[PDB]
Design a protein around this ligand. Sequence first.
Ligand SMILES: Nc1nc2c(ncn2[C@@H]2O[C@H](COP(=O)(O)OP(=O)(O)NP(=O)(O)O)[C@@H](O)[C@H]2O)c(=O)[nH]1
Ligand SMILES: [Ca+2]
Ligand SMILES: [Ca+2]
Ligand SMILES: [Mg+2]
Ligand SMILES: [Mg+2]
Length: 166
Amino acid sequence: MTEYKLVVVGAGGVGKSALTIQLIQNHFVDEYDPTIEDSYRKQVVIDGETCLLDILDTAGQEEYSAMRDQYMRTGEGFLCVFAINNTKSFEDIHQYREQIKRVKDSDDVPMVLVGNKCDLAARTVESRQAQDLARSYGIPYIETSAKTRQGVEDAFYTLVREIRQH
Ligand SMILES: Nc1nc2c(ncn2[C@@H]2O[C@H](COP(=O)(O)OP(=O)(O)NP(=O)(O)O)[C@@H](O)[C@H]2O)c(=O)[nH]1
Ligand SMILES: [Ca+2]
Ligand SMILES: [Ca+2]
Ligand SMILES: [Mg+2]
Ligand SMILES: [Mg+2]
């Protein structure tokens, strides 16, 4: 069956792990345990196609920035996550995109921009700002909450549908 290699990237604490765990295991991780690098696999049906999602959950802590080149090499599509209550995590997106762009030597890498924690009211990144960033990359913007599950499947499935346009 078709295998899709997804990689979830973004600053520390934006909810990369919570998003992936919500998708794969259907519960919300409330505590914060910083990730080094974890892998998840699950067979799903997306638009009538049975496929395997291989998801790499990466480190947001800058300490582990050295490991980025390896995972950017292998991944087929990237979920670029920031938190809507964390302006710095939004500003950090470009450095993730730029590295992906260098490594793939492509301006057309399948990606989705994800604004997570949309359940929180302390918003400092407005949807329109994020829409504009995504537009400049030629990719979709989707808001999510790993807490409520809002948008979680849409984000990952959209990344699959982007990989399929490439
Ligand atoms: N309210 C709310 N909290 C969230 C959401 N997603 C993650 N969190 C919380 O934010 C904290 C960090 O989540 P986590 O998934 O560990 O972040 P991360 O991006 O994987 N961190 P790291 O890069 O260090 O591995 C946790 O307390 C988690 O419960 C969300 O959508 N809503
Ligand atoms: Ca929990
Ligand atoms: Ca692009
Ligand atoms: Mg994590
Ligand atoms: Mg503002």
